Design a protein around this ligand. Structure first.
Ligand SMILES: Nc1ncnc2c1ncn2[C@H]1O[C@@H](COP(=O)(O)OP(=O)(O)O)[C@H](O)[C@@H]1O
Ligand SMILES: Nc1ncnc2c1ncn2[C@H]1O[C@@H](COP(=O)(O)OP(=O)(O)O)[C@H](O)[C@@H]1O
Lengths: 117, 238, 115, 238
């Protein structure tokens, strides 16, 4: 187990807020789950455990993976399918607003300054 | 638009004492308080999104852990459900269960039925394309379960820098039944080259991947979700 | 010698740093060699020459033609068509700007209704 | 965001005194210093990027001048090489030289070799598409060299305002062998209507144009560069 190793290093290093050189490339899975672990996606983790005292040490450990896991935060966003055309057009749009806002901003400013001046 | 933060949810599922354990007269250590707290003997309490005690059925664990991910996935969001635990703890009963048993099937089987239950109800102007995948990872090696001849699959990075298993097999499904078949098939193929499965699983991650793509033929808006249902390997230490 | 002329014209202007009515249209060649003489292009100019003193004149000129063109500075830019998922990025950060803009409005527009 | 500055580089190539000059007993005036300087008799030094003396061979001139452009242009940059100088100074020898002699070939011949030379060793994900065209410019009029049918071609402009010959011939090439066929083809044609060939080109401009466009299938990324191999006409006064 070097993937769980991988996994665990990913989580902890994520649980931090370090999210810088979080060892995604440490294993084949940490990369497949890269999205899942700290990005665009809604992740649920069903940590499974045994109720027996003999498994207590492991139970403890598992719980703590859950514990630390619960504090990771993903930035979820529906996935949109568009051609480059669409993306260039909508970008143009979101550039017309840019220009637009500018004026309104330079509007207020003038008044306040001007209004005041 | 504006994407939102969202803590990763965590479910604590506890399994019943099993025949050996009972016989050895072991006692149940966990003490459950409410729906999301669990105490271990006399120590600080553990609090999770939900704490699923042993009597919580397969339906319940689906409804509290996966029912909402299918809904988000069909809408353009990427859902990922995974089982983490020590070997023999409960991951596989969770994720797969008695695969063709109505009472005891697990997440995968259930997500197989939900997705198409949802879809079939949608308006005909909504055109879905569900394509499944099924690989396993052993000693850092990815083996397509649907093409056992593929045994050192690589992970490349797509159009927008997103990790992914390249060259794996992609099956277009159109029913809960064609997905089951893909499950059945990879379940057998897993044997190919395996002397001991018990030992195998105990050390291998089984990764199921429902890849959804929806299109509105009216408004033309297109969206795609990646559903990752992972059944990891024992987490037992050194 | 039209072409050579325009080329003459275009070089010396760029030489100076005048670029503004640098006479590219002075000829069809300079139009083609437009992006080459002051635009997006890594450009080399091998000025071949005769060693004979009998041609001292042109050579010298030719050296100077050579001298002039090295002072010209173009702007190199790989011509890489944007990815769909590349544009998509563009939009993305030009949406933060626009968000950061409404907030440069929000506060800026709070005082405005204060007075 | 950004494009990078960097000036036109000028290489000065001196040719060895000719038989004819020889007999007369012409004096050799050039005086070279290091590898970038040169002075005539008693003047001030003219420094260029590089300065290739008479013993400079066609392999050195290319290595000195056109080795990089190919890499550049294959990266998506635009590349342009042109020879300048009085008639009988070396331009066509340098630009074209002995076209099929592996020792006495010039820039053009070598470039076509390198282009594919490289593409072979190049990434297996990106497909190429090289498009050459070959025309001359005499008396401000643009003659298609792969079609003596066209004789008054016109310069137009593309979407981002960059000029270019209109309705010229465009030949797709996937090999050095093919590129030289076009050069070969165009070298001949130029004869159509030419009385004495020495004079004409001595007074005409031949511009070979290679248009390399590549696109990684894997990441989709599409690239493009334009190569303009131009041999100017005699620069002499009067
Ligand atoms: N009768 C039962 N009812 C409910 N859960 C049961 C029952 N018997 C066993 N289990 C549980 O026992 C575990 C058996 O699977 P398990 O050994 O834990 O899989 P893994 O080897 O993936 O960890 C399942 O995780 C599950 O929670
Ligand atoms: N180093 C050299 N050795 C031998 N011949 C040379 C050399 N450099 C140039 N020339 C050749 O090129 C020719 C010079 O004239 P030319 O190529 O026709 O140039 P252009 O008409 O462009 O000035 C000479 O006739 C000769 O064959």
């Amino acid at each position: 187990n070097k993937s769980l190793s991988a996994l665990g290093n990913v989580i902890s290093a994520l649980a931090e807020g370090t999210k810088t050189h979080v060892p995604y490339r440490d294993s084949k899975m940490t990369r497949i789950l890269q999205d899942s672990l700290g990005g665009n996606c809604r992740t649920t983790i069903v940590i499974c455990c045994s109720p027996s005292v003999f498994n207590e040490a492991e139970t403890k450990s598992t719980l703590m993976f859950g514990q630390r896991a619960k504090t990771i935060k993903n930035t979820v966003s529906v996935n949109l399918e568009l051609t480059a055309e669409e993306w260039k057009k909508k970008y143009e749009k979101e550039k017309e607003k840019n220009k637009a806002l500018k004026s309104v901003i330079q509007h207020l400013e003038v008044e306040l300054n001007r209004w005041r001046n | 638009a504006d994407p939102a933060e969202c803590s990763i949810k965590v479910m604590c599922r506890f399994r019943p004492l099993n025949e050996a354990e009972i016989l050895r007269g072991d006692k149940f250590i966990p003490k459950f308080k409410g729906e999301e707290t669990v105490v271990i003997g006399q120590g600080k309490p553990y609090v999770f999104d939900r704490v699923l005690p042993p009597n919580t059925t397969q339906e319940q664990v689906y409804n509290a852990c996966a029912k909402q991910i299918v809904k988000d996935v069909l809408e353009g969001y990427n859902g990922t459900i995974f089982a983490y635990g020590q070997t023999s703890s409960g991951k596989t009963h969770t994720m797969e269960g008695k695969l063709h048993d109505p009472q005891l099937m697990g997440i995968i089987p259930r997500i197989a039925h939900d997705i198409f239950d949802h879809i079939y109800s949608m308006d005909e102007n909504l055109e879905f394309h569900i394509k499944v995948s099924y690989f396993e990872i052993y000693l850092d090696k990815i083996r397509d379960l649907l093409d056992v001849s593929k045994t050192n699959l690589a992970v490349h990075e797509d159009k927008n820098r997103v990790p992914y298993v390249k060259g794996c097999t992609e099956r277009f499904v159109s029913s809960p039944e064609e997905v089951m078949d893909v499950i059945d098939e990879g379940k057998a193929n897993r044997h190919v080259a395996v002397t001991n499965m018990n030992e195998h699983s105990s050390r291998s991650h089984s990764i199921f991947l429902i890849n959804i793509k929806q299109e509105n033929v009216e408004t033309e808006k297109k969206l795609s979700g990646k559903l990752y249902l992972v059944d990891l390997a024992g987490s037992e230490k050194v």
